[PDB]
Design a protein around this ligand. Sequence first.
Ligand SMILES: Nc1ncnc2c1ncn2[C@@H]1O[C@H](COP(=O)(O)OP(=O)(O)OP(=O)(O)O)[C@@H](O)[C@H]1O
Ligand SMILES: Nc1ncnc2c1ncn2[C@@H]1O[C@H](COP(=O)(O)OP(=O)(O)O)[C@@H](O)[C@H]1O
Ligand SMILES: [Mg+2]
Ligand SMILES: [Mg+2]
Lengths: 47, 53, 469, 498
Amino acid sequence: VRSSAGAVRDAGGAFGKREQAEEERYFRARAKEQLAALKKHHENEIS
Amino acid sequence: STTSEQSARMTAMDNASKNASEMIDKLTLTFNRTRQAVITKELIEIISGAAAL
Amino acid sequence: TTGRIVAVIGAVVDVQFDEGLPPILNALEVQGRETRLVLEVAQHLGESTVRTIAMDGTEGLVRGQKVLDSGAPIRIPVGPETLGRIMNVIGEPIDERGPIKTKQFAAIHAEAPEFVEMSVEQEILVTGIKVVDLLAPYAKGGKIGLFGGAGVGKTVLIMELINNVAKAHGGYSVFAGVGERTREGNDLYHEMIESGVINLKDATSKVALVYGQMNEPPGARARVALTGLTVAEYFRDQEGQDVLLFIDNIFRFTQAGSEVSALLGRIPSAVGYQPTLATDMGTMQERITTTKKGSITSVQAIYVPADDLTDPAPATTFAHLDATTVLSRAIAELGIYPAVDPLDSTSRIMDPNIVGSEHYDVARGVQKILQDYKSLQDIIAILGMDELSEEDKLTVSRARKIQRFLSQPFQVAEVFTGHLGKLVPLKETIKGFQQILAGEYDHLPEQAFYMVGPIEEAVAKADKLAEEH
Amino acid sequence: AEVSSILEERILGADTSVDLEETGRVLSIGDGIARVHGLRNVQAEEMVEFSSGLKGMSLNLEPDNVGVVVFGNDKLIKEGDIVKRTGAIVDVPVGEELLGRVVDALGNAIDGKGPIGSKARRRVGLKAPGIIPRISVREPMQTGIKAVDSLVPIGRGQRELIIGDRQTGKTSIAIDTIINQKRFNDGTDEKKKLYCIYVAIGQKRSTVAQLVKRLTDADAMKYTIVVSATASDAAPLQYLAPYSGCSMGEYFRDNGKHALIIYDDLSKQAVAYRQMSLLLRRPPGREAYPGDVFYLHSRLLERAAKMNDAFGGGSLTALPVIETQAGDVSAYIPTNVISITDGQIFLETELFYKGIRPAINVGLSVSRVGSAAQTRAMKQVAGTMKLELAQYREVAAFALDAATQQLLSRGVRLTELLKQGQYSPMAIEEQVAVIYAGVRGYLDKLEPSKITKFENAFLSHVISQHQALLGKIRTDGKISEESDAKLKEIVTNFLAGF
Ligand SMILES: Nc1ncnc2c1ncn2[C@@H]1O[C@H](COP(=O)(O)OP(=O)(O)OP(=O)(O)O)[C@@H](O)[C@H]1O
Ligand SMILES: Nc1ncnc2c1ncn2[C@@H]1O[C@H](COP(=O)(O)OP(=O)(O)O)[C@@H](O)[C@H]1O
Ligand SMILES: [Mg+2]
Ligand SMILES: [Mg+2]
C-alpha cells in the first residue's frame, strides 16, 4: 500500500479542511490587495 | 530567540513524525484486517449465490 | 408456433412449446393481455422449455397462458418517420400521437461491424466547452464517455452537448434514455419542442427519442439501449449520413442485465454482477461505431456506483471509449462546473500530430501545473501558504486561476447559476490558458476567472470587481 | 342496551353466497412461506386466502407448486390446508374516507374507530405515469423548516430523500412537513391543500402511537393517513406497505388533488423484501439482497409525479427516508435510492451534536428543481443567503482582516438563524422576514449566542403588530419595494429596541 500526491485533501479529514482554509484566507487577502491596486491603476490611468 | 526557535521546531517535527508513525502502524493493521474481511465477505456472497441455485 | 407459460418468477417467464422451439433472442407475444407484453427468449432449458425475460410487467400471467412466436427478434419501426416521436423497447409509440407509419422494421439484435469496415480517421469535434476542448478533446465519429457518480453533472453536461452540437448539426440525432428518471425524459421532450429540434406540426424533426425509464422491468431497460442503437444504425447505413447518439445512462443496461442473471441460473461474479458482464457490454458497444458507410458520434453517460471508478461496470466501459471526461464530486463541491476532472480525463486524438503543438503544449502545461498544485497541497496543510517559497506561491496562484478558468456557464444551467451561457471557440480557450500560464494575468484576483467564457470576460469581470471595491 | 342492538345490526347483513371456487393444498408451510399445490389458474402476484381467513399473495409460479407469502402470522396454517384464490391482484381501499385513520399495510383500520367506508379499490402494483402526463414541477411544497425551504427547496411532484444515521432528526422533518400543511388545509382554496400520507415501516408500535398522538395534538389527522407495517408484522406486509400508501396517494393525484407520502424507512422495506426473497429460495445478490432490489424502489418512487392540467393537475410528492450506517452513504441501498430520487437532505450527527438542528448538511444537500418551486420572496432572499453560506464554509475551518472577519460573522449569524425547534414549522412569509433580517447585515452587531432570542422575539412582535405586512408578502408573493422599505424600518426599529 502506497501514498500519492494530493492525498491530504482527498481524505477530507481535519487536515484537509485546515489546508483548504489556510489556502482560502491567504488568497482572499491577496485578492483584496490586488483589487485595491487595480482600482488605483484604473484611477491613475483614467487621464 | 532564533537559535531556540529552530531547535524547538526540530524537536516538534521529530515528535510529530513519531506520532504519525505510530498512527500509520495502527492504521496499517486496521487496513489489513479490513482488506481480509472484504475478501472473505465477497467470497462468501459468491459461494452463497452459487449454492443457492 | 404456439407455446404455453409454465412458470413466472419475477421478470423471468418459462414457456413450454409443444411443436418446434423458437431460436434464442426471438420475441414471443403473450396471448390474453390487455396491453402488449413481449417476452424475449434467453435460454433453451431442454424438455421443450425456453426461459425468457419479459419486456413488461409479468402481473396477471397464468400458468398455461398461450404464447405466440413472432419468428424474429424484436423488430422496431425505423426510418425518417420515427423522428420527433418517442418509443418503447418494442418500438410502439409512447408520445400519444398515433402509430409510427414506416415501411422498414429493423431487428434490434445484429452483428457488429467487421474489422474491414473501421474508419481510422480522427478530427477534433469542437463542443464549445473549455475543459473538454482543451484537455480531452472529442472527435467526430468517436465514442465519448461521461463518467461520474450521482449529482455531479452528467445529465446537465449531456443536455448542454445536445444544445450545442445537435442544434447546429446537419445530420440526424437519436436519444436513448436507459433507466433514468421519467421527469427528465419529459423535461427533455419539452425542451426540444421549445428549441425546435422536435417539430410536432411539420416533418422537419431532427431528433428521434427512445425511452425505457427506471419504472420498467429489467427486461426493458436491458434492451432499450439496443432499440436506440438500432435506430441510430439505420440512420448510419441506409440514410448514409452523420448521426449523433446520446445515451443516458449506459450503466443501467449493465445493471438491468444483473437484476435477472441470478434468476436465469448463472453464478454471480465479482461484486454481484452477471458472469457475462464484459461480453454483454461488448456485443452492444461494438455496434456503436463509425464504419466506412456512415458515422455515429456516440455520447454516453456512465453512472459510477459510489464514485468508485474501479467498479467492474465503469472499469469495463473505459476500454470501449475514445474520449472520457471523468466528472468528479470533489471538484463539484468546490463549485467548479462542469466538474470535469482535468487529470482523470483523456482522449485518443490528444496528440501533437492531430490537434497541433500549441494546443498539445498548452494542455500538458495545464495538467502539469495542476499536478504540481496537488503535490503542494500536502505541504500547505502543515506549513501554511505564508511559508512557501516565493516561486511555489506562484505555482499555487496559477493553479487556482486555471482551476477556476475551466469552469463555464452553460445555457442549460441558467436556472441554477442564473448566469448566461457562453460558447468559447477553441482558439480562445488555447489563448486564455497559454496566457494564464505565461503570467500575463498574475495580478488579477482568482475570482475574476470564475464562471466566464473567454479570457477578456475575466478581465472585464475583474474590472467590475475593482470598480465596485 | 343499544350496544347489543348495533351488534345485531352486523349479523342482519351477512355473506350468504357460497361459490364454487378454485383451491389448492398446502404442501409445505414454514417461515411464512407456503408452497401450495393446485391453483392452476392463479395469476402472478394475485391475492389468495387461507382456510382461517388469512390472506396471502402468490409470488412464485413454479411448474409444480405456487409459492405464496402469508400476510400475517404463520402458526395457523397446517399442511394439507386449503388455499382459495380470490381472483384479484393485490389491491387496497382508497378515498377521502381514509383520512385521519390509522390503517395497516392492507388497508384495514388499526385504531378501532369502526371500518373504512372506501367505495373504491386500487391495485398496489400499478405502472407509473408515462412521459406525457407529467409536467415540470411548478408549485412549492412548504416544509416549514427554514433550512429546507430556503437552501434545499422541495416542489410538488418532486421526490426528495431524507438520508442520515439513526437519531439525527429525519422523522422530525417528516412530522414538521406534515404539521405545516395545516395552515393550507384549513384555508379555502383547494389548490394549496395537501393531504399527507405517512408509511411507517418496521417502526415499533410505540413509536407510531407517539407519532399519531403528536399529529392529533397539532390537529393534523384531519388530512393525514397513517399506514403502519410495524416490526411485528410479517415481512410480506412491510414489503407491501409502501405500495399501499403510494396507491392511496395515487388516488389523490389522479383526481386533481395534491398528496404527500413519506416512506419511513425504505431501508426496512428492503430488508423485508430480502427476507421474502430468501425464504422463496430465490438466489441472493450483493449483501444478500435480491437482484431486483433497485427495481423494488425505482418502480415505487417513480409514481410520485406531477400531472399536467389535462390529467387533473394533481401531484404526489414523496419523501423517502433512508438510514445509513455511520454515515456510509456509499452503501448499497443508500446509493440506489440516491440515484433514484431528485434532491437529497443529508443529516449528519457531527452537526446534530455541534448544535445545528436540524442537522441538514447544506453543503451536500441538493434539489434538482432548485430555482423553480420557490416563492419569489424566498427566491430573492435565500439566493443571497446561499452565496453567503457558500463563501463562509470555505473560510470556516479556522477562527483577521475586516473583510473576512465580517464574512465569518455573517456566516455564523446566518447559521444560528437557520436553527429551529420541533413541531413548530413557520409560515413562508415569517421565514422570509427572519432570513431577510439576518442577511441584510442587521444581526452582524448582535452576539451570535443571542441570535436565537432575537429570532423568537422578532416573530412574536411581527406576528401581532405587523400582520398586515405578512399578509401582503403572502398574497403578493414577493418583497415589493414598499414591502422592502417597511421590512427595513421594522427591523431597524426592533433591533435597537431589544
Ligand atoms: N430540530 C430539532 N431540535 C431539537 N431536537 C431535535 C430536532 N430534531 C430532532 N431532534 C431530536 O432528535 C431525536 C431523534 O429524532 P428523530 O426521531 O426525528 O430522528 P430519527 O433518525 O427519525 O430517529 P430514528 O431513526 O431512530 O427513528 C429526538 O429525540 C429529538 O429530540
Ligand atoms: N453546469 C452546472 N452549473 C451549476 N450546477 C450544476 C451544473 N450541472 C449540474 N449542476 C448541479 O447538479 C444538479 C444536477 O445534476 P445532474 O447532472 O442532473 O445529476 P447526474 O449528473 O447525477 O445525472 C443540479 O441540481 C445542479 O445543482
Ligand atoms: Mg441523470
Ligand atoms: Mg424516526
